[PDB]
Amino acid sequence: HHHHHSSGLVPRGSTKDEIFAAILSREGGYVDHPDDRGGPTHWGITLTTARANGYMGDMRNLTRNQALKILEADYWYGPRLDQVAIISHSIAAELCDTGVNMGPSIPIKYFQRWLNVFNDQQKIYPDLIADGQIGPRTLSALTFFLSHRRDEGEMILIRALNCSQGQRYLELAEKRQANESFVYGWIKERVRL
Amino acid sequence: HHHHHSSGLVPRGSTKDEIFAAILSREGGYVDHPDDRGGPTHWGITLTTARANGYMGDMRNLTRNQALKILEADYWYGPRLDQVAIISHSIAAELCDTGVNMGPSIPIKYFQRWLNVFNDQQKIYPDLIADGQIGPRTLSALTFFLSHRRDEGEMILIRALNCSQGQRYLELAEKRQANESFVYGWIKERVRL
Amino acid sequence: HHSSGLVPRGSTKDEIFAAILSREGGYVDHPDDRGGPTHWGITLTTARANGYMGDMRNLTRNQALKILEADYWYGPRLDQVAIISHSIAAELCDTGVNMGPSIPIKYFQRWLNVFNDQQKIYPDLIADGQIGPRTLSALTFFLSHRRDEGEMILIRALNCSQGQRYLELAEKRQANESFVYGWIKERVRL
Amino acid sequence: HHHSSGLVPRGSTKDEIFAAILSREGGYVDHPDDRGGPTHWGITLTTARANGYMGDMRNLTRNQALKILEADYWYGPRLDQVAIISHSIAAELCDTGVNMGPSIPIKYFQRWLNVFNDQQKIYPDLIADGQIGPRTLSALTFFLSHRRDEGEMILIRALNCSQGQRYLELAEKRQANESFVYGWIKERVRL
Amino acid sequence: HHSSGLVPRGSTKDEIFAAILSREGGYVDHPDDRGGPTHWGITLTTARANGYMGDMRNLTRNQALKILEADYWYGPRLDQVAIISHSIAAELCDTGVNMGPSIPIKYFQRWLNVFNDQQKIYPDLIADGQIGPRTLSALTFFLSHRRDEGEMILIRALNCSQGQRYLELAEKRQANESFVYGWIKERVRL
Amino acid sequence: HHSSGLVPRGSTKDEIFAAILSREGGYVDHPDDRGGPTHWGITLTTARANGYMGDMRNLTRNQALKILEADYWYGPRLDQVAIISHSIAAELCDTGVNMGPSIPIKYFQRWLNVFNDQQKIYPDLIADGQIGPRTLSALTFFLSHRRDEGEMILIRALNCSQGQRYLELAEKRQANESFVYGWIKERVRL
Amino acid sequence: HHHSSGLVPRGSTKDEIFAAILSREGGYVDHPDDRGGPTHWGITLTTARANGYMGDMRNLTRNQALKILEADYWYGPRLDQVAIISHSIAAELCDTGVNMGPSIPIKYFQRWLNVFNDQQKIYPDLIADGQIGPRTLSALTFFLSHRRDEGEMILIRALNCSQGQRYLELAEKRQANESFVYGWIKERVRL
Amino acid sequence: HHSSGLVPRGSTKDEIFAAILSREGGYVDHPDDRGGPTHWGITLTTARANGYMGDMRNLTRNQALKILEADYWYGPRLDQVAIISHSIAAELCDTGVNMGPSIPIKYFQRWLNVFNDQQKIYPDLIADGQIGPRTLSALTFFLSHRRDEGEMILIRALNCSQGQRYLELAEKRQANESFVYGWIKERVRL
Ligand SMILES: N[C@H](CCC[C@H](N)C(=O)O)C(=O)O
Ligand SMILES: N[C@H](CCC[C@H](N)C(=O)O)C(=O)O
Ligand SMILES: N[C@H](CCC[C@H](N)C(=O)O)C(=O)O
Ligand SMILES: N[C@H](CCC[C@H](N)C(=O)O)C(=O)O
Ligand SMILES: N[C@H](CCC[C@H](N)C(=O)O)C(=O)O
Ligand SMILES: N[C@H](CCC[C@H](N)C(=O)O)C(=O)O
Ligand SMILES: N[C@H](CCC[C@H](N)C(=O)O)C(=O)O
Ligand SMILES: N[C@H](CCC[C@H](N)C(=O)O)C(=O)O
Known part of the structure; x- marks a missing residue:
């Protein structure tokens, strides 16, 4: 059931900052997805991913900066x-x-x-x-x-x-x-x- | 084949420092074990565990302090x-x-x-x-x-x-x-x- | 069985069975797809397996305790x-x-x-x-x-x-x- | 393991069933270790210990053996x-x-x-x-x-x-x- | 098969077959998924497998006996x-x-x-x-x-x-x- | 079985059996794990299973034929x-x-x-x-x-x-x- | 899928085998979608495309069908x-x-x-x-x-x-x- | 096969086969449990499967190349x-x-x-x-x-x-x- 980010490609030699910047651009703001895919994203973040990382607010108020910290927690600091x-x-x-x-x-x-x-x-x-x-x-x-x-x-x-x-x-x-x-x-x- | 430390018990409420101190006391210096159990330990450290943690020296020269860092890497910082x-x-x-x-x-x-x-x-x-x-x-x-x-x-x-x-x-x-x-x-x- | 509420740790047999008879007290009818009628927490099948051949509406609290003791005390x-x-x-x-x-x-x-x-x-x-x-x-x-x-x-x-x-x-x-x-x-x- | 050593007539009582085991397997009888080892009155060391006999198997009486048979094959079941x-x-x-x-x-x-x-x-x-x-x-x-x-x-x-x-x-x-x-x-x- | 009635212990071949022909005598309907209709206890499949190429209604008691004896006596x-x-x-x-x-x-x-x-x-x-x-x-x-x-x-x-x-x-x-x-x-x- | 020699296509029963009795005639040793020794192609197990209770050496060609016919002709x-x-x-x-x-x-x-x-x-x-x-x-x-x-x-x-x-x-x-x-x-x- | 539509005599040549397929399955013949769908000269849309015919299946000639049969059943193998x-x-x-x-x-x-x-x-x-x-x-x-x-x-x-x-x-x-x-x-x- | 050394990336067919014949050059006898005798990197079984019926000691470099081309070029x-x-x-x-x-x-x-x-x-x-x-x-x-x-x-x-x-x-x-x-x-x- 897990939403990752296989939505686009970054150039070879791209840095961590550029990889996450490209996710926040290609999946910027609200984007709908079916319930069996984690449902809708805000800045590429599903409700489950946001809650698992401690965002307890309304998903429409999730800032680009909060989304970046969540991406970095799952895909950089976490691993x-x-x-x-x-x-x-x-x-x-x-x-x-x-x-x-x-x-x-x-x-x-x-x-x-x-x-x-x-x-x-x-x-x-x-x-x-x-x-x-x-x-x-x-x-x-x-x-x-x-x-x-x-x-x-x-x-x-x-x-x-x-x-x-x-x-x-x-x-x-x-x-x-x-x-x-x-x-x-x-x-x-x-x-x- | 994996040597852990099921050799003794520490009192309830014991700290990380006391848990590792008890391993270094109960398994102090050289202790032989069969090859199918990681072979011999120095301060509770097998040759494989020492090498996996970057000790490249002779196992007879492994200090108690180096053994403590290896225990902390596998059982505290690593996890x-x-x-x-x-x-x-x-x-x-x-x-x-x-x-x-x-x-x-x-x-x-x-x-x-x-x-x-x-x-x-x-x-x-x-x-x-x-x-x-x-x-x-x-x-x-x-x-x-x-x-x-x-x-x-x-x-x-x-x-x-x-x-x-x-x-x-x-x-x-x-x-x-x-x-x-x-x-x-x-x-x-x-x-x- | 009866996983229906917590009994204080170290409760005696009598208190275990008393607590079942209190939390599940009294003749309560249910459709056939829900065990049928219950009385003192005893299903029709449990009562019949223990030799109660009467109407479930007439099952006494004392008969219910005997069935509980048979299934959860003397039986085992x-x-x-x-x-x-x-x-x-x-x-x-x-x-x-x-x-x-x-x-x-x-x-x-x-x-x-x-x-x-x-x-x-x-x-x-x-x-x-x-x-x-x-x-x-x-x-x-x-x-x-x-x-x-x-x-x-x-x-x-x-x-x-x-x-x-x-x-x-x-x-x-x-x-x-x-x-x-x-x-x-x-x-x-x- | 069990007592497939003989048959008793139809209509035999519990007392007769156990008496027949104690007669056909009376005193010491050797058996290999892979079959529970040697019996005294049909009782193995393991069977006697599991039933609380802590003594020497050579001193197990006929009467103690009967209580062990009754425990395993009558009262236990x-x-x-x-x-x-x-x-x-x-x-x-x-x-x-x-x-x-x-x-x-x-x-x-x-x-x-x-x-x-x-x-x-x-x-x-x-x-x-x-x-x-x-x-x-x-x-x-x-x-x-x-x-x-x-x-x-x-x-x-x-x-x-x-x-x-x-x-x-x-x-x-x-x-x-x-x-x-x-x-x-x-x-x-x-x- | 013919599990339909109990026959006295030690019944002869003749009595085993006689009992089937009486308890299942003449036309008896059964659902299509169970061999369909029987005459003298014989299904159309059983009759045809034994070489009866005629109509089931015209199957005589005596023809039914031969089929039974072929499947349950001579065949085995x-x-x-x-x-x-x-x-x-x-x-x-x-x-x-x-x-x-x-x-x-x-x-x-x-x-x-x-x-x-x-x-x-x-x-x-x-x-x-x-x-x-x-x-x-x-x-x-x-x-x-x-x-x-x-x-x-x-x-x-x-x-x-x-x-x-x-x-x-x-x-x-x-x-x-x-x-x-x-x-x-x-x-x-x- | 008898995989020992090729028989002309369309050989009769008599010729199939005659060919076995000739190619495997009299006493022939085989290892104990393969039925042991044969007389006229008949193993002791095969002979006994067919009711020959005598000695293998005294088994006649004619007795061997009956055993072959029982296992490969009348039996089937x-x-x-x-x-x-x-x-x-x-x-x-x-x-x-x-x-x-x-x-x-x-x-x-x-x-x-x-x-x-x-x-x-x-x-x-x-x-x-x-x-x-x-x-x-x-x-x-x-x-x-x-x-x-x-x-x-x-x-x-x-x-x-x-x-x-x-x-x-x-x-x-x-x-x-x-x-x-x-x-x-x-x-x-x- | 294949051509189990008829038999040719013993001793038939490759040319006769393929000629017999083109005669018994000549022109348009409907078949359900779960069987490769409709054939032209015995050729399915999938078979023709896999062999490089990019045209309309209605314009597939007898001669093009023969080359496709020979590719699948003679030269390919x-x-x-x-x-x-x-x-x-x-x-x-x-x-x-x-x-x-x-x-x-x-x-x-x-x-x-x-x-x-x-x-x-x-x-x-x-x-x-x-x-x-x-x-x-x-x-x-x-x-x-x-x-x-x-x-x-x-x-x-x-x-x-x-x-x-x-x-x-x-x-x-x-x-x-x-x-x-x-x-x-x-x-x-x-x- | 021949996983025996690295060939430059983009090597042509001829260079691939030339490199096999150089790295594995010359008639070298081995016991039966090691493929038996080799010549130009060809095993006895590989040569026979490709129709060489001669002595492995007489296999020419040109015949070895043909076998390699059959198994790794024309064959596939x-x-x-x-x-x-x-x-x-x-x-x-x-x-x-x-x-x-x-x-x-x-x-x-x-x-x-x-x-x-x-x-x-x-x-x-x-x-x-x-x-x-x-x-x-x-x-x-x-x-x-x-x-x-x-x-x-x-x-x-x-x-x-x-x-x-x-x-x-x-x-x-x-x-x-x-x-x-x-x-x-x-x-x-x-
Ligand atoms: N479940 C995450 C990784 C879980 C990491 C988890 N062990 C943690 O506590 O952060 C995923 O596939 O994105
Ligand atoms: N293999 C270790 C844990 C491995 C941790 C490993 N993933 C690391 O890179 O430290 C063990 O059972 O003690
Ligand atoms: N063999 C036992 C019944 C087992 C109890 C089991 N039936 C349950 O209550 O889950 C008896 O004859 O009483
Ligand atoms: N003799 C039994 C042992 C089990 C009886 C046991 N549950 C008990 O008495 O506690 C047997 O050999 O199969
Ligand atoms: N003569 C039949 C026997 C089949 C009997 C079997 N079809 C049944 O009745 O269950 C045969 O030639 O094997
Ligand atoms: N009369 C035997 C036939 C068995 C034949 C089988 N044992 C064999 O030869 O492979 C029977 O009564 O089934
Ligand atoms: N007609 C074949 C397809 C495979 C042939 C393929 N390997 C090729 O030509 O590349 C078949 O239906 O079983
Ligand atoms: N079927 C192919 C042989 C396959 C090649 C394979 N045998 C190998 O070299 O691993 C032929 O008749 O030439």
Whole structure:
């Protein structure tokens, strides 16, 4: 039943601020949706999402600034992409862009699985549990990966993440759970092979 | 295969500092364990746990202070019990005590399920996903629960958590995955009906 | 059953049954799709299963108490438990009224198996939900060392099982959330 | 586990059933550990301890063994309460109980009482839990009020049918002796 | 089948069929989803399957008897059993009419397998529900040890299988409870 | 069974059995897990199941023939089929000797069901693998429309079922590939 | 979906097989939407579009329909390549393919080639993928080198056996016409 | 297959096959439990399946190339794809050599189905892994609008499928982690 934000695309290299600015522009003000999709949004926020984040007011009075804090709570601070960003701005921004469209745990689990494959049979760091949750272990794994592979590793991990997402879009489009025009555009703007 | 710390009990009302101090005393220095249990510990830390948290040194040189930071990363900061503690010291301390014996996600999922039952058909706050992960939504749910039920609610939620843990200990003891003397002692010191 | 209101913790058998007869007092007719007619909280099927062949309108308060005692006390043999521990018997009776007597008796047997120390003190019981000589002998041997402490710990263990069961029932909408909150609240102690 | 060692004549009493076990399994008899191990008067170490005998198994008297058999196969299953309503049904449940475990024949007994209650006109359906309590006793009382002595004999033959078919299934899995099953049909089945 | 009335214990083949032809005599309507209308207890499907290509109204009592004997006597080869034991053949025929012939024949083969010791008197039969030379040879070798006792014991064993099956059918509402009670009653002996 | 050699297409019952008695003549050892030693192709289990209580060494060729005819001809009731069509009976017998008699009989019943239109010529048979009055009546009504064509077509249909089954057996290594190739080769026609 | 509308004589060529489809399904024929909808020269809208005809279905010529049948039932399955090695096997696969879809008979063909390779002495086992490529062609080449014309006839009769048994299973689920199956055994089965 | 070393991105068919023949050069004997003898990277089974009946020691480099082209080019019909798009054909060939040709062809078909716009541009293909007229016609219609862009996007989509497949293979220890890291590294672009 979960409303995310698979409504448009931001250019590659876009920051957290630009990702959330693009959601607040493309989904600005009141937009109706069916009850089975979280119902109507104000600045992209459903009543359930607003209440889950502690907005107890009338949804017609929700300001753009309050909506931004709610987006940041669900898609940046909640999943601890602020902590990822201290180690790698580009990995944090990629996880955030995929998180707003699929929900943050999806790309984080792919992230953990890819860090496990690149740890060289656990010589560089031990295998993570793919729980979808950024904590000290995942952050330490990313730190040791980037110490050994440097900036080449960063770019490779982003491409690896794009591969996981691309194949997920194939499976969703096949079950009619993703728009085919959207998936074609995503590959054109986000996939760097 | 996962080494936690179900080795002893701390008195009810014990703080985070006392919970971790008791682990460092009862599991002080080198203690051997079979390879299928994470192998040997130094200050209760396995080689895998130390490496996962970024200790790259020799396990015989791991200081008590470094071990404390590793325990706090896995059982306090990692699961965000520091954020829970800002709202309720007693709920954070209870989650921490159960977390060191079963692994933090177990008690956190029970915590989320109990907050869902006490939200009165989603009038006070919407249902959480029981993902085992403390983030803004779970913290906002605890904030609204404690605003409506006050200190009585806090104590009731701790007792509810004890019930979930007690029944889990029955199921573990039945599969020989928990010591029966330990479970008898746990009910005597921790269960306040 | 009768999950219809909270009884003070540690209520005796008589108070448990008195509280049912008060909260559900008096002949109240209902259509066939709602158990048919009730009297003193007894359904037509419960009365007939216990040998009342009369009109439900003529069921006396005294006959209703006998039926309750048969289904929730003598039937499950809590009279025999009470000879060893009136407190454990009263706790099994209160839970039995809410869930059906076999549920708490099975938790009781499973907990006695955990505390039998790898079968040194007594062998493992079958968790059949039936109080007989073996379950009674197991409770007797458990209480043999530290009677005071053992009784209190076993009741705390039964509360843990029942509390987790209330979580699972509330999650399936088979228990009222206010009831479950009140049930824990009544039992909070230091 | 149980006592499938011999047969007693049709119409044998509870006292005769237990006396026959104490004679055919009298004193020490060795058995392998995977069968409860050695018996004294037919009692395993586990059975004696579960019934509160804490002594040495070599000092277990015939009389203590009889109390343990009665606890497991008569008083525990509440066949004493059945016997007040029908001595012949109680004796038949007890004879089968000592061979199979008392819960097996009691469940068949409840299922047959449910069939003979005529779509719940005479009494409501029992839960077939294998446990004798006031409801099962009340159902037997109402069955025997409407069917009288004919019903009592009919219910015993119905139980014999359930037990006979169970012996077929057990013999097929090698969990019952075939000579025993042939002798059991010969002595006990009256249909 | 023909579960319609109780026949005295030990009825012959002729009496089993005579009883069906009397209790279901002439035209009797039944709903289309249950084989539709019967003449002398024979459905159109049953008649056609046995080579009756005429009109149901013109089906004689004598033609109906042949169809019954084909489906419940000659088809299952009970004529060959009858050469060895008329009383076993009559028992299998009575049960076959009620349940379908393969049910009692498989019980028959399973019981012959238990009474062959450990394949010392004869080897285990496949319980296929089909009477053939091996099943006939097994009955012959079983009866060569204590004929009267064996026949009596094997009929008692078959009665046990059939009685338990009546419990299972009554429980699924596929057999009338009065029928089952009357069936056991007719067979009670000392 | 007897998968041991290819017999000319359309061999009679007598020739099918004669070929088994020649290719497996006298004493032949086989491992205990495969029925053990044969005399005239008869295992001790097969002999005893058919009432031979003597010594295997004293089993005559003539006694072996009777056992073969009981298991592969009279038991499956191919004698009754032979009255309607000797060529269908001979085909079922040859396949029965190779696969066990119930396999080809069930294919036979399934094919009769397809060629009954929509139950217009005769009703659907249960594919139980048992030859009885209904299967015989269905073959009689099938053959009453174009006897020669029908017999030929039904034998072709049976050949199709059996050939596909040989593919499945060869794939599981339960049939020799040279055998299967030779089996089809013998039956190739224009 | 396919063309189970008629039979052609034994020994019919690919040209005759396709000519027979174009005659029995000539011009417009209505069919319900749940069966691919209406045909022109036996071609559905979906079949024509999948083969690159972008025009109006009413303007589809007999000759364009023939190219579409050949694409789906001859060139696509590579029966042209089979035909170089054996015209008679290619024609038999094509006749079955037009009724069932070409992959069904090709898989049976591969499974029978695996049985006749004599435990992989003459050629190794094929994957039964339903697809004609160099391996399946090489296996047919080596089979026909060791078995010659007898093998070719034997492999066709083996295919007929697989198809006949498949018709039994389809007729039983009401997915094939019984008169058609009877006529198919009569005309095509030569065993 | 040949997952044995990395080829530069966009390598042609000839370079893919040249790189196999260099990295796996020359007759190298192995025991029967390791594929037996290899020559130019061809196993005994691969050579025999492609019609080489000679001694593996005499296999020429030219014969090895023909076998590779049969299994990884002409066999899967990448020669026909190449007429429409040499770039897509080369990418399917490179993936086919590593995984088996049906894997990338099935991803290719599934991606063509996603980009057919709810079947407005061409109907959905069966993802059978077989390049035939329908798959070729679908690629032709896809490339009909924005040939340049479509080709590049379809190759990026195939890289996504193959990259995720390498994750799953590395997780089951069926792909080398250094290989997978190098495979992505070779393909990083801006
Ligand atoms: N695997 C840990 C928790 C993992 C937390 C992980 N998601 C992190 O990145 O810290 C455990 O059971 O102790
Ligand atoms: N349920 C959210 C994530 C829940 C995070 C939760 N564990 C928290 O307490 O913030 C979602 O899919 O957007
Ligand atoms: N003898 C029984 C044990 C269960 C009786 C038990 N519920 C009790 O007495 O407490 C049996 O072997 O099946
Ligand atoms: N076997 C018991 C009845 C079990 C009680 C159960 N029927 C309920 O009250 O839920 C008896 O014969 O009294
Ligand atoms: N006369 C036997 C037939 C069994 C044949 C079967 N045992 C086989 O040969 O496979 C019977 O009485 O069923
Ligand atoms: N002669 C039939 C017997 C079928 C009997 C079965 N159709 C039934 O009555 O239940 C046959 O040829 O198998
Ligand atoms: N059906 C194809 C063979 C498929 C290729 C496959 N056998 C592999 O190389 O993995 C053919 O007849 O050539
Ligand atoms: N007609 C085939 C479609 C698949 C052929 C395809 N793989 C191609 O040509 O690309 C069928 O109906 O089963």
